[PDB]
From a paper:
On the other hand, U2AF small subunit, U2AF1, binds to the 3′ side of the boundary sequence between the exon and intron, known as the 3′ splice site (3′SS). Then, the recognition of 3′SS by U2AF1 is a critical step for the determination of the excluded intron for the production of mature mRNA. U2AF1 consists of conserved three domains, an N-terminal zinc finger (ZF1), a U2AF homology motif (UHM), and a C-terminal zinc finger (ZF2). As U2AF1 was stabilized by the binding of U2AF223, structural and biochemical experiments were carried out with a complex of Schizosaccharomyces pombe U2AF1 with the short fragment of U2AF2 spanning residues 93–161 (the U2AF1 complex), as previously reported.
In order to clarify where and how U2AF1 binds to RNA, we solved the crystal structure of U2AF1 complex with RNA containing 3′SS sequence, 5′-UAGGU. Nine copies of the U2AF1 complex with RNA are found in the asymmetric unit. Without RNA, N-terminal 14 amino-acid residues are disordered and not visible in the electron density. This region of U2AF1 is stabilized by interaction with RNA, and ten additional amino-acid residues (Leu5–Lys15) can be modeled in the RNA-bound form. The −2A base is stacked by the aromatic ring of Phe20, and is sandwiched by the side chain of Arg28 in ZF1. The O4-carbonyl oxygen of −3U forms a hydrogen bond with the main-chain amide proton of Ser34, whose hydroxyl side-chain hydrogen bonds to N3 imino proton of –3U. Our present crystal structure indicates that U2AF1 has a strong preference for guanine at the +1 position in the exon sequence. +1 G forms a π–π interaction with Phe165 and cation–π interaction with Arg150 involves the six-membered ring of the base, which lies further from the RNA backbone than the five-membered ring.
Author numbering:
A (entry chain B): 106 to 161
B (entry chain A): 2 to 194
Write the structure that this text describes.
Amino acid sequence: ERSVRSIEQELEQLRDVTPINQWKRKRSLWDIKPPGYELVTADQAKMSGVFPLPGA
Amino acid sequence: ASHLASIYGTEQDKVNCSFYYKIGACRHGERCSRKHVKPNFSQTILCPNMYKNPIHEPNGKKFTQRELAEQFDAFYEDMFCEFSKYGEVEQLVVCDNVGDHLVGNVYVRFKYEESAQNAIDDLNSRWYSQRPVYAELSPVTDFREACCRQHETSECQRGGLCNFMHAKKPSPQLLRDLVLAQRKYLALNAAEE
RNA sequence: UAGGU
Ligand SMILES: [Zn+2]
Ligand SMILES: [Zn+2]
């Protein structure tokens, strides 16, 4: 099979590249909630009406 | 005479909304007189109002052209990396418009339709920058048919209120590093078999 | 209900 041939071929040319799952992300704004909303889920916050989309 | 002519998805299709079919967003929203067919299967997802351009806030115009470039690169990196955990990201587009329907819209086209469905199922319960993220499947397929032409060459006279996508492109260095990083991550999740 | 087939 050439599958393991091309996989190790691609890996070797990308030796000095970091995989995307490893990348150190400084100041990642994901999962950051506003103060006081630690116990509020994202679904409950959207239905509350405090976080409307600009269209509405 | 090689094939029948059609008008579906065009601005002559007076029943379906051409703008929602191509751009995935319409200024009229849910009150539109024309049809917005929301796909049940799609490779592309939509996260509206995800990107808040600092230039549209107080102290926005307190930044240099280099600082603004590094800040948007930080956002595009933060977007691409997180969306990659759901599947192979074919393209990531960030809209710099100011219209209510397109402001800060983040479109993500995955390689498989299952990766797009898994993304919206997980994103709709997550937060980003102290705001809950809205995620949905988008009918957008070819971004060339949704981008503004006069904005690519020179500037568009309609400005930020243009109803076509005014995509903000990241640095080519970051985009290249992201595509190579995803290929390695995908290649590493292949040597296990 | 448009500028974009
Ligand atoms: Zn519409
Ligand atoms: Zn434009």
